[PDB]
Amino acid sequence: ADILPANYVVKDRWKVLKKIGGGGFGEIYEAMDLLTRENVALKVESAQQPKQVLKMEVAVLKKLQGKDHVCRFIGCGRNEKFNYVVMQLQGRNLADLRRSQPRGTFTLSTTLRLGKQILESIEAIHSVGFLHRDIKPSNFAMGRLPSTYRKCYMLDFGLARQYTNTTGDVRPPRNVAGFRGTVRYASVNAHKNREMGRHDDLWSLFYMLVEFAVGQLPWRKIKDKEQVGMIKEKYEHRMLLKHMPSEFHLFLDHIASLDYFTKPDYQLIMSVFENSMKERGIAENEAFDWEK
Numbered sequence: 193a194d195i196l197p198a199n200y201v202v203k204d205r206w207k208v209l210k211k212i213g214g215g216g217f218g219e220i221y222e223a224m225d226l227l228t229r230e231n232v233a234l235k236v237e238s239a240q241q242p243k244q245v246l247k248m249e250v251a252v253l254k255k256l257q258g259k260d261h262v263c264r265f266i267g268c269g270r271n272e273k274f275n276y277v278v279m280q281l282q283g284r285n286l287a288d289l290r291r292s293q294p295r296g297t298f299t300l301s302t303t304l305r306l307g308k309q310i311l312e313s314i315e316a317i318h319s320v321g322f323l324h325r326d327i328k329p330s331n332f333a334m335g336r337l338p339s340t341y342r343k344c345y346m347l348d349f350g351l352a353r354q355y356t357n358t359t360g361d362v363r364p365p366r367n368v369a370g371f372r373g374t375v376r377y378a379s380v381n382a383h384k385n386r387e388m389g390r391h392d393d394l395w396s397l398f399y400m401l402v403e404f405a406v407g408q409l410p411w412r413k414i415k416d417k418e419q420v421g422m423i424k425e426k427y428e429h430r431m432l433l434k435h436m437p438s439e440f441h442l443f444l445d446h447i448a449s450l451d452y453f454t455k456p457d458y459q460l461i462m463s464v465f466e467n468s469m470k471e472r473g474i475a476e477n478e479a480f481d482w483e484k
């Protein structure tokens with residue numbers, strides 16, 4: 193059963209309309225804001241749940257206000273039954289949009305333009321001293337307004353972790369860290385139980401764009417964490433570039449050379465996407481595949 197029934201009113205302000213998803217770490221609802229009249233997104237987690245992600249969600253979301261590709265923060269609170277975060281509601285997510293494609297693939301035009309936007313998201317979260325650690329298509333969605341439908345947003349921050357400390361320096365990595373995020377888009381370092389860094393969020397971006405353009409990843413059907421890790425360790429990553437723009441070699445070589453300590457060259461990755469667009473006559477004003 194759902195944590196919240198339909199028509200439930202959170203803090204005499206947010207009326208639950210329907211459940212829109214969730215799964216692991218909690219549930220997400222569409223709610224009507226009775227004070228603003230705006231349809232909002234409401235994230236709730238049981239107060240008797242062992243892992244409490246919503247405190248992190250709020251901290252990162254607050255830090256990212258003013259930045260592009262982030263939901264506006266509406267409110268938050270906690271009671272004896274559940275914890276909640278209220279934020280700007282968006283349109284369809286990228287995993288849903290990709291699955292709705294005829295061949296489950298996007299065009300290089302959509303792939304490259306989403307890549308630019310997701311990369312700007314990653315750069316922004318890293319700029320406030322946090323790692324995302326759960327970069328996947330279902331964590332990104334297009335806007336639902338006429339002024340936002342072409343903009344891509346980073347939806348969740350539950351598995352995020354501060355990599356900087358109080359003084360603005362990079363904190364020492366732990367000798368071991370428990371696996372965080374999706375199994376499909378996790379880097380080989382995450383599979384090895386190593387402390388995740390900025391480069392690991394760029395590995396997830398790399399895998400996601402290959403899946404966008406090709407429609408699948410070699411380890412698509414394998415659910416076992418260890419088995420996927422062995423495939424990724426053994427798999428010659430150059431093979432993933434077979435149907436990708438040629439500048440993607442530069443992207444793969446860059447991330448493969450990084451570690452926890454080294455700041456990524458975000459501009460190098462951006463130039464890969466920009467050159468892959470200009471060399472194909474791809475315009476920034478083009479329509480996305482779902483608009484076709």
Ligand SMILES: COC(=O)c1cc(Nc2ncnc3[nH]ccc23)ccc1Br
Pocket residue numbers: 212213214220233263279280281282283285330331333347348
């Ligand atoms: C893992 O994420 C999902 O599966 C999922 C997430 C959302 N999340 C959102 N959907 C729409 N607007 C949102 N704002 C903040 C979060 C959010 C909605 C539906 C699914 Br189906």
